[PDB]
Symmetry: C3
Subunit: 426 residues, 3 copies
């Protein structure tokens, strides 16, 4: 093995460097930012100076929270429009219901994990659920863009001392109502065979425009993350506790992802398929390695097709339509983990009623996240804008997201292949 | 007569039940809601409990006030775009001017009725008219979505004690500026013969999408109205006065609709046509019966064409273009009645200056209301959002709207047929 | 010469009157408004009365600040989309870079002039530049529509007395972020050869719709300006100082425009072309006279083509693509002059840090102003909404804009012809 790399060590790496430039550049940026923040700590310097130095970080944050809304709305509209055309039968509905219930299982197991292990170091619950149910329908799109709905207590109703609710408003970004409206509108427009042809192409072109808008603006990410890390490290005190907290987050996410991959998914596969998933893993290991390496679901998609066609012994007839609609419709688990950790870090009360609300917000946020490989930053922007919490804690959760992205894409390919197998069985 | 129904009484009603399911379901929902509210009155129960019980009612209200804006704007844009194409001559302008002046006569006679009979049991007038004239042009669409313009008095200007005006803003929904901007934009895009072809189809497809969005979401109306009635009945005290007020509203609306149908309209018909409208009624009674039964103007539209073609002795040449543009461009009278009653119920001052403002708001609201048969709820949402008054009083005015809808559609078919006759004469 | 006009004095002026009706009507309206304001000054009359009288002026202002946003966004989107198609090579990028650097030279020379002559009679500068850099990316389009970002000082941070910044928001219109987002989106959609074909036509049709929306609504301008002048003259006291200030503005703008025309532009032409610009002026004087007369760049565009083709001895090959993209992509100088004068009039502090911000705002505002000849009013609305200052001072700066428009169009044709020559040389 070591002899082959000693024979291939010739000076031809420029093509490989250019093909995988983004990951190396962002890793180097993170490393240099951490080094600069550590070495700039002794030099005491003012708050105005730290804002001046760290401006590009929040500038990148501002650009991403520009991109948050049109990206998700247009991508989900396009996906919903394409779902009806490709999945014209009952098996497509079966597949989407299967994927919905699997992601519900993922989010509930994740919330149970975060409740029981505590990674961080009716009075409101009923009100929180009530406000979520109301939040599915904000006043309209314009209000949903910049403020949510939140119940208050005006204390003057009706010898009268009670926790009387009263309507109120809270600023932020209301994705949940927006995302559900987008889902319904996409379903309606996809129900069109010919009447919606003109409308579908315009939204698709807008979707591709937003795709390349995200793509071109992401080349600024290295220096922005560099400066964000450098600015945030020097102003944050007691590095030991934050390091312990980020280590606990890393352990929590890695353990949860592996257990969801290798217990609940094999169990549900064996429940219905009644076959051995180990042979499936042996057949698909090549595709899994390719997904781990490239860290791109779309790039390894033909590899997955060929692997399931030749090695896994899967009938090819079902494969053209279940996989693409499923890909467009484990990300929710990671969103919920990040959101609950962010809520826990800033000493919030963390009631048992808001946990379900943040779980639903996270699972709705990740439906139309992006088609880019490195979608961690945009997803974190989505969830932090939808929940309203401050978005300054990006650095800690993105300092390790490069490996979490490989884990995300490998879990995605496992889930997609097993869904293809289960719909082949049905 | 009774023998025919005794011979047709065979057990084949499922098709008729399915065809007219919506009206029966909503009537049953209203009846059961009234019964439940009456029987739940003795059981004393808390305000939090009543909000919990009545949540689906305001949930339906929230969905309708979502649908209020895109529905009206897109429907009116499509109607204005189609008006220029179908009505390419001076007779189309004559017809639209005729319909505008008839609806002005309707709204003014309605406001005179509500002033003189009082169905309910320069200091501001000039300012109100000034603010309406300013309100035709809000800052822009985004501001018009969620807040209007309202003049205030800051009391500190220029030995200086005067009612000095000062600009201000009031939250709500500004339909009037939005609706007039939509009318102007639709006229401009309809002036295009070929350049606006691409833009027209996109808006038309969006219009059909909103049509079926309203259609699919209306299947939730029965249970929502059930719960709204049940929640509102139990919290409202002194049922006698509210029953008297709703009876007075019913008498007012029915009397006004009949008098506008059988005095002013026949008088203006005889003024120009110089013919006997009684023969017209005899010719069109079949179409009137069909409109009363189906309660759908679009469904009885071919019936109206065939009736005017064969029985009324009307030349067919004019009929393809006057009727459809007129239908798209008595509803304003009912909107004004409901709005003035809602204003009178909550003990508002009801100055002589705001009556013209609410009349103009109502007549602008009903122009692009909907194409659905049961458009009462959406129209009430439109007017209550455009005026800013609370939208909790829907139940009282919709408890009888099933019969008012038949009256509305029969008045609409009378007006459309008489307009077709008058433009045939010209 | 005088004999020819004595022979052409026959009574055929109705065609000329109709062709140039707008300028004569607006000049007559301004004159009559000034006369009415002067003669109504002795008649003392109340503030409510003056608002009643001057309502149509701010009504016109409201309509223009309706038109401000869609006009600029759609026109710039269309221009950016058309730029890539027509300018498919490196010479188009060279031309746009040349025009950008020329307009930067214009705006900087204008700001130096206004600083040195004073036409009117790190604490914030660094903060102002920081807020401008942040302002390129507002939260999103909806927030950018009605409020900007402005830094504040909360005075409670960390024995702690410092000018600590804190984020804040200020209402208005945020064109800069909107305009830069529009530029980027237009570039992205213009990069499409076939995929963006469907999206481009819809935006182009919307652009033409907005064009004729501006055109049709401008027929109301005469009476609106009449009433605005009449209302503003009578309420403004000490006419002498305001007359001196407007005379100083006229001198400043005319001197700056002529010096930018006949020093810096000929110098840069001689630097690269190494030819005599006087022969160029002799060749193009016919086109310059036509531009001065018609005051329309588009109308005299074929005249400019024929003049450069036959008299200036310019190769025709380059001329189809450099001129149109340059026209769509001296106006910035006039915008900056007007904005700095408006800032100076109302006794603002006028720090050395906000001057660059207002210069950048003005130069970004004029990029997608309009294609209409009399675009002064709309441009002033653009700049006053983008800066947030009151928009009541339109009358003083538009009382002479008829001649400034001829100067603007002649400077535009000089610049376009010299750019065509310089790109022919390259």
């Amino acid at each position: 093995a070591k002899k082959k790399v000693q024979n291939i060590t010739k000076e031809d790496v420029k093509s490989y460097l250019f093909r995988n430039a983004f990951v190396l550049l962002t890793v180097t940026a993170v490393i240099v930012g951490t080094i600069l923040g550590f070495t700039l700590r002794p030099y005491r310097m003012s708050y105005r100076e730290v804002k001046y130095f760290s401006f590009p970080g929040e500038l990148l944050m501002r650009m991403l929270q520009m991109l948050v809304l049109p990206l998700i709305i247009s991508s989900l509209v396009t996906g919903m429009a394409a779902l009806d055309s490709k999945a014209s039968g009952k098996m497509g509905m079966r597949a989407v219901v299967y994927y919905m219930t699997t992601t519900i299982i993922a989010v509930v197991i994740g919330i149970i994990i975060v409740i029981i292990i505590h990674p961080g170091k009716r009075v409101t619950a009923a009100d929180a659920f009530l406000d979520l149910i109301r939040n599915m329908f904000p006043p309209n799109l314009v209000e949903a863009c910049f403020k949510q709905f939140k119940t208050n207590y005006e204390k003057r109703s009706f010898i009268t001392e009670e926790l009387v609710p009263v309507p109120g408003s809270v600023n932020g970004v209301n994705a949940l109502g927006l995302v559900v409206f987008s889902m319904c509108f996409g379903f309606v427009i996809g129900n069109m065979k010919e009447q919606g042809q003109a409308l579908r192409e315009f939204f698709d072109s807008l979707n591709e425009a937003i795709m390349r808008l995200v793509a071109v603006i992401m080349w600024y990410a290295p220096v922005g993350i560099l400066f964000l890390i450098a600015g945030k490290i020097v102003e944050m005190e007691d590095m030991g506790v934050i390091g312990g907290q980020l280590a606990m987050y890393t352990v929590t996410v890695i353990v949860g992802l592996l257990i969801h991959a290798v217990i609940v998914l094999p169990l549900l596969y064996f429940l219905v398929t009644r076959k051995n998933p180990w042979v499936f893993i042996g057949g698909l290991l090549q595709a899994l390695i390719t997904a781990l390496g490239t860290s791109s679901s779309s790039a390894t998609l033909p590899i997955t097709f060929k692997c399931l066609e030749e090695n896994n012994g899967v009938d090819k007839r079902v494969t053209r339509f279940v996989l693409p609609v499923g890909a467009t419709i484990g990300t929710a688990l990671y969103e919920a983990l990040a959101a609950i950790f962010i809520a826990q870090v800033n000493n919030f009360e963390l009631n048992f009623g808001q946990i379900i609300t943040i779980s639903i917000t996270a699972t709705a946020a990740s439906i139309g996240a992006a088609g880019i490989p490195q979608a961690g930053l945009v997803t974190m922007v989505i969830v932090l804008t939808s929940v309203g919490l401050p978005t300054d804690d990006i650095t800690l959760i993105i300092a390790v997201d490069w490996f979490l992205d490989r884990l995300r894409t490998t879990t995605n390919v496992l889930g997609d292949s097993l869904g293809a197998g289960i719909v082949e069985h049905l």
